[PDB]
Amino acid sequence: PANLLTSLVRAHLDSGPSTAKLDYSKFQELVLPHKEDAGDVQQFYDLLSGSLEVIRKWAEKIPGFAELSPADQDLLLESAFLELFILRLAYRSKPGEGKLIFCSGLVLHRLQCARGFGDWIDSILAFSRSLHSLLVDVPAFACLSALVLITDRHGLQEPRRVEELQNRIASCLKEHVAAVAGEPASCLSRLLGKLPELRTLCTQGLQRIFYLKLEDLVPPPPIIDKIFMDTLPF
Template sequence: MRGHRGFRHRVMGIEQSGPKTVARTDSLKGRRGRLPSKPKQPPDASPVSLITSLVRAHIDSIPSATKLDYSKFQESAPCPFEKEDSVDVQQFYDLLTGSMDVIRKWAEKIQGFSELPKEDQDLLLESAFLELFILRLAYRSKPEEGKLIFCNGVVLHRQQCVRGFGEWIDAILEFSQSLHRMSVDVPSFSWLPSLCTQGLQRIFYLKLEDLVPPPPIVDKIFMDTLPF
């Protein structure tokens, strides 16, 4: 009898605990859909492979000399001391958004980037956009000639940009001269936090002027970067 009673208690215990176990499993399944699988490792995640993909992506995204767009280039431009108008502001926004498209295509060629969730890709690009814009523009441009070569291959003279970009364009050209002299030291790279600040200040000023509404991507980058 004692053994029978013990067996009966064990059976009742299983019956009582069974539904709870099932309920917890169903709850977990309903909440998460399925248990996460082990993330797949890229076929080759070595530092050498990553550097190779970065270099290749950089080379592929640089407009070749034969594909540069000089259709709007002119050395004699309206007086830079005059106040910017809607045409200047629209050009400024078009250059930023055009560069964003090229930088996105560059990033998609970097090993592992395309495997990230879309929202993470957007966050990375938006948070680093101004730094990449400055660095790539400074690297390609010819400051001694006053030529600015943008990501999409458009070539403009400093005089054509100064009313839209304001003093920011001269700071970028100074940084470009430093890169071309190969004197890229810690102080030079520290300019990249201050140049980005100038860029944000310029966008803020043009938003206040309200001559042309900023494109959604420019407005989002600006709003997401605000400290408040």
Template sequence: MTSDSLTRSRPRSPAGDGGQHVRVFYELLSRCMEVTRRWAQRVPGFSTLHAHDQDLLFYSAFLELFVLRLCRPADGQLVFCDGSVLHRLQLLRGFGEWMDGIEQFSAELQRMDLDVTAFSCICSLALLTERHGLKEHKKVEELRRHSRSRPDQLSRLLQKLHTLCIQGLQRIFYLKLEDLVPPPPIIDQLFLDTLPF
């Protein structure tokens, strides 16, 4: 399925070929991962980190960034960071219950009406979170200090994002067990590198 066929498709019910819905899920994650990786390289200081730490931080934070950078304009539509516009009915079979949490968080984020600076700060903090296995802890912490503002508000949002990330990993795990469609290598790597359970 091409990007064009995913973008601005008409909503259909989640019934039908389960494998196709899972493919849409994997392709969407894969394309958004590429877009998000390019964004991460532009975060001040990120590209100066050890290559191992860049990979660890990126894969650990990707699902949080995926949720953060999703827009929920109206009428059940969702706009993803790769430009795909899909109706929630097209996503339910692939996303499962994770979709409910994503939509609730997206709606809360929109109600907060954050300015660009605050939103960029949240994204940077999600990327630069302390992770087990980092080679340059102090360098990451220094970058994180430069991104910090409104600590109470951001801390609460980051905690919710962490919970959503775990739910996303659980969804990938379920789909791997269901085995309708094998996950692409990049999704397998994401799953194995961030598995907390």
């Protein structure tokens, strides 16, 4: 509980690259020069897709998660995807240097991403800089990300079990944020204050996917497309 914290930490660390598996072979801080094209849209989608399988395997190692109904599992994963992608990217990346680090280990400069992502990448970097100012340690991050996934959503079959699991992870976080600050609220409410901002960023991502689907240079991969279509409240 305790052991929960440890499970969450192990699941986080196993879901991303070792600082020795960082791939800088494509990184270029300088770019030449300039609307988006097909290679930029394909990379955007590819980056998005590479998190799918990683985040699904990460969730299965959250104790309690595999014991939710299968329909609630998928609804949670699908509804939280964009926000988890953003949160983990922001935490992993190095915004002081314009460096995006993706879950494969691939390192890219902000300018190598701008054309695909549009403005959204700047907003993600702003968020990253703000997340970095909190100096969120790994166990606290391991809880936060899990709280992004395990949260109320319209259409849950067992909303109370999801809440129960959310409460356990919240307690685990609260306790950890005390046992390291010296107990007895501020840090914690500043941390939890990152979740609504993350929703707002999820929306900017939906706008970018909309726009790209409008322009129709390359189709989105079917699973991303489904997430986009299923998370539209209309």
